[PDB]
Amino acid sequence: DSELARWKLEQAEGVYASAQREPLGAGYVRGHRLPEGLGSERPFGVTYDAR
Amino acid sequence: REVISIHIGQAGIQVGNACWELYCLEHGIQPDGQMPDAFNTFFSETGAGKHVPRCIFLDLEPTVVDEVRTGTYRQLFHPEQLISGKEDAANNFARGHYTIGKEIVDLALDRIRKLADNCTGLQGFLVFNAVGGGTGSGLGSLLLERLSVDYGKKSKLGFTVYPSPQVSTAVVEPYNSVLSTHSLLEHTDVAVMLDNEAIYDICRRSLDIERPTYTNLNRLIAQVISSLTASLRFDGALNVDITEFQTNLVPYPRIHFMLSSYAPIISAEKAYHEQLSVAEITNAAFEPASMMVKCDPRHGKYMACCLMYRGDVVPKDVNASVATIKTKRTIQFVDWCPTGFKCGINYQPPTVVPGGDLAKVQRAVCMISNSTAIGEIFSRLDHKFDLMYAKRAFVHWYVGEGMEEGEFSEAREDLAALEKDFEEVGA
Amino acid sequence: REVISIHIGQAGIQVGNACWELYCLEHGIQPDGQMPDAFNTFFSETGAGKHVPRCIFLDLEPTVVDEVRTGTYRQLFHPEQLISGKEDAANNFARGHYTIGKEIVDLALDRIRKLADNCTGLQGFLVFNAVGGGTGSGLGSLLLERLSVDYGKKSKLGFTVYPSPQVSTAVVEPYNSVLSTHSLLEHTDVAVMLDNEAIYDICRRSLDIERPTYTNLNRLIAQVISSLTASLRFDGALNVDITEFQTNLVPYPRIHFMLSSYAPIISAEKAYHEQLSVAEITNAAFEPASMMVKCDPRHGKYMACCLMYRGDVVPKDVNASVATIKTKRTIQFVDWCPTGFKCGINYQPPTVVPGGDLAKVQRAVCMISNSTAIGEIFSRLDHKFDLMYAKRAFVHWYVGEGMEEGEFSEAREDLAALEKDFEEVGA
Amino acid sequence: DGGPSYNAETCMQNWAEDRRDKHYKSGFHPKELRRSTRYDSEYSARFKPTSADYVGRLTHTYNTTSRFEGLTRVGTNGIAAPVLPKRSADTSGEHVFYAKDGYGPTPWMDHTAPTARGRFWVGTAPHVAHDTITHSTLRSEPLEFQQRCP
Amino acid sequence: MREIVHIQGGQCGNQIGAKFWEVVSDEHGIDPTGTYHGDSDLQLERINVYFNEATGGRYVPRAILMDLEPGTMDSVRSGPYGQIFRPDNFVFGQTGAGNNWAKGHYTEGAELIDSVLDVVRKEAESCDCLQGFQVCHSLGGGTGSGMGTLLISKIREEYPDRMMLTFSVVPSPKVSDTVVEPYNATLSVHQLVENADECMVLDNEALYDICFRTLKLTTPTFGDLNHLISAVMSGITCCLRFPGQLNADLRKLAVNLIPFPRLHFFMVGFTPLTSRGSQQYRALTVPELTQQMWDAKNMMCAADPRHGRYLTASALFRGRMSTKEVDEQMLNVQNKNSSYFVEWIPNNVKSSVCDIPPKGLKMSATFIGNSTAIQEMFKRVSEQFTAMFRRKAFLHWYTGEGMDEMEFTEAESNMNDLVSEYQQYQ
Amino acid sequence: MREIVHIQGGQCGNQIGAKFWEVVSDEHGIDPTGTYHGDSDLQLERINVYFNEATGGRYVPRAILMDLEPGTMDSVRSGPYGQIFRPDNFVFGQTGAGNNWAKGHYTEGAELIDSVLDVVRKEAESCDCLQGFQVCHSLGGGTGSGMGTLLISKIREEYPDRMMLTFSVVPSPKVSDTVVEPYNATLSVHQLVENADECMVLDNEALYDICFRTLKLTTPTFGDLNHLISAVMSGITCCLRFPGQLNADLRKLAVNLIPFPRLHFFMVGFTPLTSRGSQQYRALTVPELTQQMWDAKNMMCAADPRHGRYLTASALFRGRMSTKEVDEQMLNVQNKNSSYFVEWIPNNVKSSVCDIPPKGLKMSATFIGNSTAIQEMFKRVSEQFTAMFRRKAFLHWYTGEGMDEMEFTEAESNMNDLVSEYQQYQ
Ligand SMILES: Nc1nc2c(ncn2[C@@H]2O[C@H](COP(=O)(O)OP(=O)(O)OP(=O)(O)O)[C@@H](O)[C@H]2O)c(=O)[nH]1
Ligand SMILES: Nc1nc2c(ncn2[C@@H]2O[C@H](COP(=O)(O)OP(=O)(O)OP(=O)(O)O)[C@@H](O)[C@H]2O)c(=O)[nH]1
Ligand SMILES: Nc1nc2c(ncn2[C@@H]2O[C@H](COP(=O)(O)OP(=O)(O)O)[C@@H](O)[C@H]2O)c(=O)[nH]1
Ligand SMILES: Nc1nc2c(ncn2[C@@H]2O[C@H](COP(=O)(O)OP(=O)(O)O)[C@@H](O)[C@H]2O)c(=O)[nH]1
Ligand SMILES: [Mg+2]
Ligand SMILES: [Mg+2]
In three-state form (DSSP H/G/I as H, E/B as E, the rest C), the secondary structure along chain C is: CEEEEEEEHHHHHHHHHHHHHHHHHHCCCCCCCCCCCHHHHCEEECCCCCEEECEEEEECCHHHHHHHHCCCCCCCCCCCCEEECCCCCCCCHHHHHHHCHHHHHHHHHHHHHHHHHHCCCEEEEEEEEECCCCHHHHHHHHHHHHHHHHCCCCEEEEEEECCCCCCCCCCCHHHHHHHHHHHHHHHCCEEEECCCHHHHHHHHHCCCCCCCCHHHHHHHHHHHHHHHHHHHHCCCCECCCCHHHHHHCCCECCECCEEEEEECCCCCHHHHHCCCCHHHHHHHCCCHHHECCCCCCCCCCECCEEEEEEECCCHHHHHHHHHHHHHCCCCCECCCCCCCCCEEEECCCCCCCCCCCCCCCCEEEEEEEECCHHHHHHHHHHHHHHHHHHCCCCHHHHHHHCCCHHHHHHHHHHHHHHHHHHHHHCC
The residue among C309, C293, C290 whose CA lies nearest residue C203 is C290
Nearest-CA residue for atom 8 of ligand 1? B11
Please name the member of B47, B79, B80 whose beta carbon is closest to the beta carbon of E283: B47
Active-site hit among C244, C274, C280, C287: C244
Spatial distance between the Cα atoms of C9 and C144, rounded to a whole number of angstroms: 14
Please name the member of E42, E78, E231 whose beta carbon is closest to the beta carbon of D96: E231
Cα-trace Rg, chain A: 18
Experimental method: cryo-EM
Taking the alpha carbons of E279, E285, E291, E293 in that order, is the dihedral positive or negative?
positive
* Helices C214-233 and C9-26, axial angle in degrees (round to 10): 50
Eight-state DSSP code of residue F107: I
The 10 Å CB-count burial string (b at 16+, else e) for F199-232 is bbbbbbbbbbbbbeebbeeeebbbebbbbbbbbb
**Separation of C201 CA from ligand 2 center, angstroms?**
19
Helix, coil or strand: residue E351? strand
Report the pocket of ligand 4 as residue ranges, CB < 6 Å. B 238; F 10-12, 15, 99, 138, 140-144, 169, 171, 177, 204, 222, 225-226
Question: Are B197 and B294 contacting, i.e. CB atoms less than 8 angstroms apart?
Answer: yes
The 10 Å CB-count burial string (b at 16+, else e) for E104-133 is bbebbbeebbeebeebbeebbeebeebbbb
Which residues are within 8 A (CB) of B82 and not within 5 positions of it... i.e. 6 or more apart? B56, B57, B58, B65, B68, B69
> CB of B423 within 8 Å of any CB in chain D?
no
Helices (runs of H) and strands (runs of E) counted in chain D = 4, 0
Q: Give the DSSP H or E segment for F82.
A: none
Residue among B207, B272, B357 with most chain A CBs within 10 A, to mutate? B272
Compute the residue count for chain C: 427
Distance, CA of E137 to chain centre: 8
**Separation of E50 CA from ligand 5 center, angstroms?**
61
Beta bridge partners of F8: F65, F136
**Single-letter amino acid, residue C343:** C
Cis, bond preceding B264 (omega within 30 deg of 0): yes
Is A6 within 8 Å of D46 when comparing Cβ atoms?
A: no
C10 is in an annotated binding site: yes
* Helices F375-390 and F405-425, axial angle in degrees (round to 10): 150
Helix, coil or strand: residue E209? helix
- What is the atom index within ligand 2 of the atom nearest the CA of E245? 6
Window D:35-64, CB contacts with B under 8 Å: 41-44, 46-51, 54, 58
Please name the member of B209, B275, B361 whose beta carbon is closest to the beta carbon of A43: B361
**Single-letter amino acid, residue B240:** V
Kindly report each contact of residues E414-419 with a partner whose C-beta sits within 8 Å and lies 24 or more positions away, as own/partner.
Answer: E414/E189, E414/E190, E414/E193, E415/E186, E415/E189, E415/E190, E415/E378, E415/E381, E415/E382, E415/E385, E416/E382, E418/E193, E418/E262, E418/E375, E418/E378, E419/E375, E419/E378, E419/E379, E419/E382
Spatial distance between the Cα atoms of B422 and B300, rounded to a whole number of angstroms: 11
CA dihedral F147, F149, F155, F158 (to 10 degrees): -100
List phi, psi (to 5°) of F369: -115, 125
Beta bridge partners of B291: B261
Nearest-CA residue for atom 24 of ligand 2? C90
Spatial distance between the Cα atoms of E204 and E226, rounded to a whole number of angstroms: 10
> CB of A17 within 8 Å of any CB in chain B?
no
Q: How far is A37 from chain B (nearest CA, A)?
A: 11
**Separation of F105 CA from ligand 4 center, angstroms?**
18
Q: How far is C378 from chain E (nearest CA, A)?
A: 16
Spatial distance between the Cα atoms of E18 and E225, rounded to a whole number of angstroms: 12
Q: Which residues of F touch C362 (CB under 8 A)?
A: 55
- What is the atom index within ligand 2 of the atom nearest the CA of E323? 29
Q: Which residues of B are annotated as a binding site?
A: 10, 61, 134-135, 169, 196, 218
Eight-state DSSP code of residue F87: T
Q: How are the residues of chain F apportioned to helix, strand and coil, as percentages rounded to the nearest 5?
A: 45, 20, 35
Question: Are E348 and E314 contacting, i.e. CB atoms less than 8 angstroms apart?
Answer: no
Spatial distance between the Cα atoms of F233 and C97, rounded to a whole number of angstroms: 75
Which residues are within 8 A (CB) of F246 and not within 5 positions of it... i.e. 6 or more apart? F323, F351, F352, F353
Nearest CA in chain D to A5: D37
Please name the member of E15, E39, E363 whose beta carbon is closest to the beta carbon of D89: E15
Pocket test for ligand 1, best of B6, B65, B161 (most atoms within 8 A of CB): B161
Q: Are strands F129-138 and F90-92 parallel, antiparallel or unpaired?
A: unpaired
Is E278 within 8 Å of B48 when comparing Cβ atoms?
A: no
Eight-state DSSP code of residue E339: G
Question: Are F358 and F284 contacting, i.e. CB atoms less than 8 angstroms apart?
Answer: no
For B10, half-sphere exposure in the C-beta direction (CA atoms, 13 angstrom radius) is 16
Q: Which residues of F are annotated as a binding site for Mg(2+)?
A: 69
Burial class of residue F81 (count of CB atoms within 10 Å of its CB; 0-12, 13-18, 19+): buried
Q: How far is E128 from chain C (nearest CA, A)?
A: 10
Question: Are E49 and E4 contacting, i.e. CB atoms less than 8 angstroms apart?
Answer: yes
Helix, coil or strand: residue D15? helix
The residue among D108, D96, B78 whose CA lies nearest residue E273 is D96
CA dihedral C187, C192, C198, C200 (to 10 degrees): -90
Beta bridge partners of E53: E59
Q: How far is B228 from chain F (nearest CA, A)?
A: 16
Cβ neighbour number for residue B3 with a 10 Å cutoff: 22
Window E:325-384, CB contacts with D under 8 Å: 355-363
Burial class of residue D83 (count of CB atoms within 10 Å of its CB; 0-12, 13-18, 19+): middle
Q: Is B244 a catalytic site residue? A: yes
| Protein residues within 5 Å, CB atom, of ion ligand 6 | C 10, 133, 135
Window C:327-356, CB contacts with E under 8 Å: none
Nearest CA in chain C to E351: C169
